[PDB]
Amino acid sequence: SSNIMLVLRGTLEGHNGWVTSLSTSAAQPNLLVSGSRDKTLISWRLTENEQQFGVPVRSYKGHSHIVQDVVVSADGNYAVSASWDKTLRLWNLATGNSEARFVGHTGDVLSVAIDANSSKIISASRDKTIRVWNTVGDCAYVLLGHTDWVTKVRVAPKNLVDDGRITFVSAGMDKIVRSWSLNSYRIEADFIGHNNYINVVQPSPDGSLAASAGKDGQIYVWNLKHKSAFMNFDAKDEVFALAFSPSRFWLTAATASGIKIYDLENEVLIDELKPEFAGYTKAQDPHAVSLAWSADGQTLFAGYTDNVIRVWQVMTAN
């Protein structure tokens, strides 16, 4: 239960529609970008004062269609955005100019992810294909793993110094999530588990505990480094996003009903975040697409369909 509770300390809004994803760099907590269905990207610089926690610092007339998956480099200078328009754009954040268009995909690019060295980008599209790009703009590797639809791709950082392999995880629609390495250059394992169909796979801040989310009502977490099945945590609703804490061992889950908070090691069902809206009956209630922390571990951002980002500041009760 604890004493540190979640209270809203600001609502951020600038996008004129759905916000599909948001991300923060490991180096800089101040800059958190936000990608929208409104063809656009808006970077937030964080100031903490009163209500305006983060104001628009760099907006972009980026892609033509939807900025659907956004991943920024660990340093915070290359911002790589994906789209349904089959392309991916690399962004210089301080200036506000594009660098390289990664043109190769036959369908809509559903996931972008950046390497630990910020060099070997990896993209997956609704195609059956998972391409590997360079920051220059070169196709390196076309991964054929999933027999149906690929949706999410995430990279796990490594500590125990440098064993060789670079660890990737890819969500599917065949009911099998796949594990990749880049150097044994390809497959590591097949992590079967999900009952419904997979949405969001989120790895641990250490880079081993990867939670896979679905539509059924249970999150299935895996231990990647030792190649084993960890636990199945309860959710009840359809899951849209996951957010692992840099602060402690918290998991924050975006569900169909609202937001549900859990922990990694201790099987607890802590707090439910459900904000108040204008109008609405019951089933119409807007639920967040994607949610992300920062690096401080004090703040949570959640991109709602209703345009909203909601800054929950985790602070002590007494």
Partner 1 sequence: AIISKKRKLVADGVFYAELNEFFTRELAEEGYSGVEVRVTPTKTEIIIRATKVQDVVGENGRRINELTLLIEKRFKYKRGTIALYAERVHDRGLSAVAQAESMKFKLLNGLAIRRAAYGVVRYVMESGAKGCEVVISGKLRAARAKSMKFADGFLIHSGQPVNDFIETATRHVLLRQGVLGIKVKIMKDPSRNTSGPKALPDAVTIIEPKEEEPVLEPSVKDY
Partner 2 sequence: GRVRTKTVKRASKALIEKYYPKLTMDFQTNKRLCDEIATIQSKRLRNKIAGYTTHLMKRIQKGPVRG
Partner 3 sequence: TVPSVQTFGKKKSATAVAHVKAGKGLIKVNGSPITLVQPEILRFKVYEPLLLVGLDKFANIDIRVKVTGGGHVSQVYAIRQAIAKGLVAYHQKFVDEQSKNELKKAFTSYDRTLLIADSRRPEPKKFGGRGARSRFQKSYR
Partner RNA sequence: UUAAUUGCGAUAACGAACGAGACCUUAACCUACUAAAUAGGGUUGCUGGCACUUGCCGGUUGACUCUUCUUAGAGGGACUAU
Binding site for partner 3 (CB under 8 A): 14, 42, 55-59, 61, 96
* Binding at 283: pick from partner 2, partner 3, partner 1, none (beta carbon under 5-8 Å per type): partner 2
Encoded tokens for 31:
């800059």
* Binding at 126: pick from RNA, partner 2, partner 1, none (beta carbon under 5-8 Å per type): partner 2
Encoded tokens for 249:
């061992």
Name which of 52 and 232 has its Cβ closer to partner 1.
232
Name which of 57 and 256 has its Cβ closer to partner 3.
57
Name which of 186 and 274 has its Cβ closer to partner 1.
186
* Residue 64 Cβ vs RNA, minimum distance, rounded to whole Å: 4
Residue ranges binding partner 2 (CB under 8 A): 18, 37, 66, 84, 108, 126, 173, 196-197, 215, 283, 305
Name which of 18 and 250 has its Cβ closer to partner 2.
18
Residue ranges binding RNA (CB under 7 A): 61-65, 84-85, 87, 98, 101, 103, 284
* Binding at 103: pick from partner 1, RNA, partner 3, none (beta carbon under 5-8 Å per type): RNA
Cα 170 to Cα 150: distance, rounded to the nearest angstrom: 7
Comparing CA positions, the residue from 159, 154, 193, 164 lying closest to residue 177 is: 193
